[PDB]
Each structure stands twice: as structure tokens, then as C-alpha cells.
């Protein structure tokens, strides 16, 4: 088609429309579906990103880097690039929608949820006789949350986009499998560490098929996990 904008420009436009009389313009389900359709076509070369290949990783070096593309009050759009053998630890997206698409490599994405009484669940407190390895401080015991591990699959550039919602698959961990990997990430609304919309990390507690119930404990961002910026080489998103 003539006069078509770059795919990344069109993705950014559609995320803007999705998240933010006559004839009626689309609603959220239609828009979300279109956004996912655009993302299924996205390839690494469309962002002028070459697949990387490849340690040990010294503390001096970030395991993951970040390639910023665009953001509004409604959404953020960027690329995360994982080095070999690294992972983005388990974390949530409070009140956020998200969608991601692998550009190269393979990632294992573990998807979970905290049990929510608003979804008809009845979250219980840790029973007193339940013990873990490592053992929990008594203060920790009362901060434990019940959750469910829903899925734990591997995704590549050929997989469909991975979607999460405020209430479904809202917690995830992303491990680079067998070498470096990278993915485009859309989040709506963006994180706001200043306005109380933080990225919270969690660990799964150790007391056989999925879905299965788990116990989750919020934890600080890991000492050795950090993610610094690097130049984005793809087509610019205007303005």
C-alpha cells in the first residue's frame, strides 16, 4: 500500500487509540484486537535491531537494557533486551494492561495472579503449620499472599503477542532461554513510581501441574537486577 507509515508508527498510533461520534469509531475490544494484529506482524528488522548472540556478567554490566520508543499518559512503548542467561524477575503491573512481542531469541514467560476476592476468589492467610525453605520471618508470614501459577511457556518471534490485564496474568517473569532475547513491550497506563503505580517484585515460596496454587511474597528489586538504557535504532515515532 502507498503512503503507509512505518509499522512502529502505526503500532504507536493504534496503542494511542486503544488506551488514550459519526460514524462510530472502534471501542476497546476491537481496538485491542487491532493492536494485537499489528504486533503479530512486527519483526526485529522493522525496528532495525539485529539479533544478538552470546559472560559471566559482572556487577558492572546490566543484565537487561531498555530501548525507549514512545510514551504518553496512556501507554508506554519500548524494547527490553535480555542478555544470555538473564531474566526479568517476577513482577506485577498494578491496574495495567500489557502486551508484548518477541523480536528474537526465546523467552520463558511465567504468568501468575494474586488471588483476588473481586474475582470470586477467597484468599486465605498462610496457615500457621505451613513452613518454607528458607523459613519465613514472622513479619513475612503475615505479608504472604495466595496466588496461582497459570502458565510457564516459551515464546519466540513466531509466537503470538503475550497479553496481560489488570486482573489476569498480571504477574510475570521473563527468562532468556538459550541465549540473548528481546521483546517489544506495551504497557497501559505506564508505571508511575512517583504516583503510586510501582513495579512490584515477588518470589514464589517453597513449602505438580498447572494451574496450581502458590504463595507469593513481595520482595525488593533484586540487588543484581537493573536495566539501563541504550540507543533505539528503529524508525522514530512522530512527533
Q: Which residue ranges are tagged as binding site for Fe cation?
A: 91, 93, 172
Phi and psi for 142 in degrees, rounded to 5?
-85, -5
**Which residues sit in the known binding site?**
91, 93, 172
Alpha-helix residue ranges (DSSP H) falling in 86-224: 138-141
CB half-sphere exposure, 206, CA atoms < 13 A: 3
User: Residue 50 in contact with residue 115, Cβ under 8 Å?
Assistant: no
Task: Give CA separation, 128 vs 104, 134, 138, 142, 147, in Å.
Answer: 46, 16, 10, 10, 18
User: Residue 147 in contact with residue 214, Cβ under 8 Å?
Assistant: yes
Q: Which of 84, 101, 95 is nearest to 39 (CA)?
A: 101
| Measured distance CA(118)–CA(4) in Å, rounded | 44
| Measured distance CA(192)–CA(196) in Å, rounded | 6
User: Residue 186 in contact with residue 164, Cβ under 8 Å?
Assistant: no
Amino acid at each position: 500500500r502507498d503512503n503507509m507509515a512505518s509499522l512502529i508508527q502505526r503500532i504507536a498510533r493504534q496503542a494511542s487509540l486503544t488506551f488514550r461520534e459519526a460514524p462510530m469509531q472502534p471501542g476497546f475490544p476491537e481496538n485491542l484486537s487491532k493492536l494485537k494484529s499489528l504486533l503479530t506482524q512486527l519483526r526485529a528488522e522493522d525496528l532495525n535491531i539485529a539479533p544478538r548472540k552470546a559472560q559471566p556478567l559482572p556487577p558492572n554490566l546490566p543484565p537487561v537494557t531498555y530501548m525507549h520508543i514512545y510514551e504518553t499518559d496512556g501507554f508506554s512503548l519500548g524494547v527490553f533486551l535480555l542478555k544470555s542467561g538473564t531474566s526479568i524477575p517476577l513482577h506485577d503491573h498494578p491496574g495495567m494492561h500489557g502486551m508484548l512481542k518477541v523480536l528474537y531469541g526465546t523467552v520463558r514467560i511465567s504468568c501468575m495472579d494474586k488471588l483476588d476476592a473481586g474475582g470470586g476468589q477467597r484468599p486465605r492467610a498462610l496457615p500457621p503449620e505451613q513452613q518454607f525453605e528458607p523459613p519465613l520471618q514472622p513479619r513475612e508470614r503475615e505479608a504472604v499472599r495466595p496466588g496461582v501459577l497459570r502458565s510457564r511457556a516459551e515464546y519466540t518471534e513466531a509466537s503470538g503477542p503475550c497479553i496481560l490485564t489488570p486482573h489476569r496474568d498480571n504477574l510475570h517473569q521473563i527468562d532468556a532461554v538459550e541465549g540473548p532475547a528481546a521483546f517489544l513491550d506495551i504497557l497501559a497506563p505506564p508505571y508511575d513510581p512517583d504516583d503510586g503505580r510501582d513495579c512490584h517484585y515477588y518470589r514464589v515460596l517453597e513449602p505438580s501441574d498447572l494451574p496450581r496454587e502458590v504463595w507469593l511474597l513481595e520482595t525488593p528489586q533484586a540487588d543484581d537486577f537493573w536495566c539501563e538504557g541504550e540507543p533505539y535504532p528503529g524508525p522514530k515515532v512522530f512527533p
